[PDB]
């Protein structure tokens, strides 16, 4: 419902008209598996000393 423009016919141009909005992810490429089963890998690094 963010108003991009007003059409002078007292009608509003909104983002829904020109775009498709959804809650997705920042990046979709990387993945992780645990025995052929999707999982989120957490790499833990040991602090020095």
């Amino acid at each position: 419902n963010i108003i991009l423009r007003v059409n002078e016919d007292k009608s509003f141009l909104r983002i829904k008209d020109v775009a498709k909005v959804e809650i997705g992810a920042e990046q979709y490429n990387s993945t992780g598996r645990l025995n052929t089963s999707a999982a989120v890998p957490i790499i833990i690094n040991l602090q020095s000393g």
Binding site: N1, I3, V6, K10, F12
Partner: protein, 50 residues
């Protein structure tokens, strides 16, 4: 508040208090975005004026 009442009524504790106070008066600003853009107004300009 419920937890504080439970701690007050039993469990061998003398003083139980919370510093969470939600009684402060506030003015909630409701922006009519349709009316705000019906006049050619930017939101940031409005809040800079405020």
């Amino acid at each position: 508040n419920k937890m504080l009442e439970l701690a007050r009524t039993r469990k061998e504790l003398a003083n139980v208090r919370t510093t969470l106070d939600t009684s402060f008066p506030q003015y909630k600003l409701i922006i009519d975005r349709d009316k705000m853009k019906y006049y050619n107004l930017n939101m940031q300009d409005v809040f800079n004026t405020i």
